[PDB]
């Protein structure tokens, strides 16, 4: 799907060959636009504590006539592209970040052209940063230990 | 108390006006190396489901001494510098990313220096990909739920 859940957040898997022009470019083609679009409007429906972090992923197939010197480079200015998008269509700045994994800790092994096609990626990655818990704990602990 | 819990995850807080030559630059003062060693060797002592994400963060000072464009990039590079070194000392590369957030998510109004000195920040979280629940709700869905 391209909706997955964990429990700490919601994934949605955007493939890098929908989202960009060609292998190394970080430009989003226009056809794609209002799909981001409509990504910022469901994000204006969500608790007012959601973060949203845009995630860049690669293959690792080397690179090559690009300004581009690393995989988490292309990553990184992958990842934040679709964030300066997300802005551009209203999302508060304040709820957004871009993470950058590069060729690292891949979806599928780097041994077929469907599995390095997983492998290029935009995930946007919702969680919040719920402290709740973490408070309980640490006003239980200072009362209760020395 | 450089460490702070969040119901997600940890949050490790370096002292990243220490080590960065100036507040607008991605180079590591080599006098302070020591202290990413020191992580990294504790790194280790976690297991390998932990994903650990380095993240960077600025003030809202216009860009003064440097190469880069925007707060984007000056606490991307930063953050990833991070992530270098703990790479160089033995972190799995396979478990490490990094984040920027810019200027955005101040912890203080930037309307002094010293409050702007504290935006500009890299921390560490700490966390992991845990989807036990998700898969019990999903098969609890498809059962009284089905479609």
Do not use: W
């Not at 909706?3 to 060959?17: A, C, R, T």
């Not at 690393?70 to 592209?81: G, P």
């Not at 690292?104 to 995930?123: F, Y």
Request: avoid cysteine; glycine fraction near 2%; charged fraction near 25%.
């Amino acid at each position: 799907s391209v909706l997955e859940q964990i429990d700490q957040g919601s994934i949605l898997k955007l493939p890098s060959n929908l989202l960009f022009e060609n292998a190394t470019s970080d430009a989003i083609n226009q056809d794609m636009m209002l799909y981001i679009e409509r990504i910022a409007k469901i994000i204006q429906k969500l608790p007012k504590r959601v973060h949203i972090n845009v995630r860049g992923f690669t293959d690792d197939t080397p690179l090559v006539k690009t300004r581009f010197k690393s995989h988490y480079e292309l990553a990184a200015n992958r990842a934040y592209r679709v964030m300066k998008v997300l802005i551009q269509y209203g999302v508060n700045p304040n709820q957004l970040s871009f993470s950058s994994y590069g060729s690292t800790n891949p979806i599928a092994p780097n041994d077929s052209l469907e599995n390095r096609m997983k492998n290029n990626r935009v995930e946007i990655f919702f969680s919040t940063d719920a402290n709740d818990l973490s408070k309980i704990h640490s006003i239980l602990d200072n009362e209760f230990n020395p």
